[PDB]
């Protein structure tokens, strides 16, 4: 007999094709997509709880650290730490999905932009994406002069929220 252990279910009618109908079935794909999403975070979320080995401290260092004053520690509340871990987890999700693609935005009206950045129609990748519009025929006859009320200004540089109040308050020149 045969079964798929992501779904945990046995196949009802065993043939080769019923397997392939289950192997590329919508239900089964959503399981195996979700199964590896759980094993991804679990290696990171279950952080290596290391084992400590405490040495018997010296007579010398015990006197040199006694004269040194005891520093204050900061412990947050349970309600506080449940929110701050909700934030810091959601922040690391953002740094995954940045993908800084300003450079594609800069060469928009150039003479080979269809052939290099559209990426349905390169050579290296182009045959593979057609399986799984802005065509390759585009030349520099259409849109001769870019600035004819068409172009958008460059989106300004991003900044950190936490340190949003380090910015100089006034601009040097008067913008419109």
């Amino acid at each position: 007999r045969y079964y798929c252990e992501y779904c945990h279910s046995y196949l009802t009618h065993d043939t080769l094709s019923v397997r392939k109908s289950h192997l590329v079935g919508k239900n089964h794909l959503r399981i195996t997509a979700d199964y590896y999403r759980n094993k991804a975070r679990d290696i990171i979320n279950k952080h290596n709880h290391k084992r400590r080995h405490i040495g018997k401290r010296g007579r010398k260092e015990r006197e040199n650290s006694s004269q040194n004053e005891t520093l204050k520690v900061t412990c947050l509340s349970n309600k506080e730490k449940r929110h701050i871990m909700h934030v810091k987890k959601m922040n690391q999700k953002e740094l995954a999905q940045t993908s800084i693609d300003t450079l594609k935005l800069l060469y928009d009206g150039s003479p080979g932009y269809s052939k290099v950045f559209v990426d349905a129609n390169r050579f290296d990748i182009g045959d593979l994406v057609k399986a799984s519009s802005r065509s390759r025929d585009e030349t520099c006859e259409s849109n001769p002069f870019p600035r004819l009320n068409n172009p958008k200004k460059l989106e300004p540089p991003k900044i950190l929220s936490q340190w949003s109040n380090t910015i100089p308050k006034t601009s040097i020149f008067y913008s419109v």
Partner: peptide
């Protein structure tokens, strides 16, 4: 997951005097 990492910077204007007009020629 309410707030975000980054914002575009907002900034105050310098009130438009003769010394800080970017179109000025004279």
């Amino acid at each position: 997951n309410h707030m975000s990492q980054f914002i575009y910077p907002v900034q105050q204007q310098p009130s438009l005097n003769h010394f800080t007009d970017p179109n000025n020629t004279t």
